[PDB]
Amino acid sequence: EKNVKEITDATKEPYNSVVAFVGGTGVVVGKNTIVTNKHIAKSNDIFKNRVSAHHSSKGKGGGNYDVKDIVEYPGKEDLAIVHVHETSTEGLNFNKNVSYTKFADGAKVKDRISVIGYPKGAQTKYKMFESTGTINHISGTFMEFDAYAQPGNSGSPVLNSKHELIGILYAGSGKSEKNFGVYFTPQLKEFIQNNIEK
Secondary structure (H helix, E strand, C coil): CCCEEEEECCCCCHHHHHHECCCCEEEEEEEEEEEEEEEHHHHHHHCCCEEECCCCCCCCCCCCEEEEEEEEEECCCCCCEEEEEEEEECCEHHHHHHCCCCCCCCCCCEEEEEEEECCHHHHHHCCEECCCCEEEECCCCEEEEEECCCCCHHHHHCEEECCCCEEEEEEECCCCCCEEECCHHHHHHHHHHHHCCC
């Protein structure tokens, strides 16, 4: 499917749970806590760059926050928890500027979904886009779906028709409307929830 539209004002739910990292996307799931791919969290710990809360071309900025630490999922699944320092260098409070996305507790093949993130962010001044499609396959912690996705979408939340979080994108395929995600099973949900700051 190729139905991709810019979210010009991402201060509204659920767009204000989406965050931009230099080369990808993450989603806020609880107090000071973001989910994204492993390499996005990791390569960010080399330059120690900030994460921007819901950057969009027209929306009031949500702040740019420093990373406190990362917790990688132990398994091979491409999932990492990123904790941020609650107060930005500009005195903005992360929790006042984002929302926490709720879990879907799974999905089904043929479900209609949205992938929201920053495709080609370094070429667009980090415009947020939502891309719609359908879940084509679910197995274990793997899912495939056909929403158009590009470089910049790794870590993007995949949402259901009620704006709840099913998983996150981790990869495309070939030369992309056949894209792969981490599908959140109870085990991955429990991993995430156990690692939200109290």
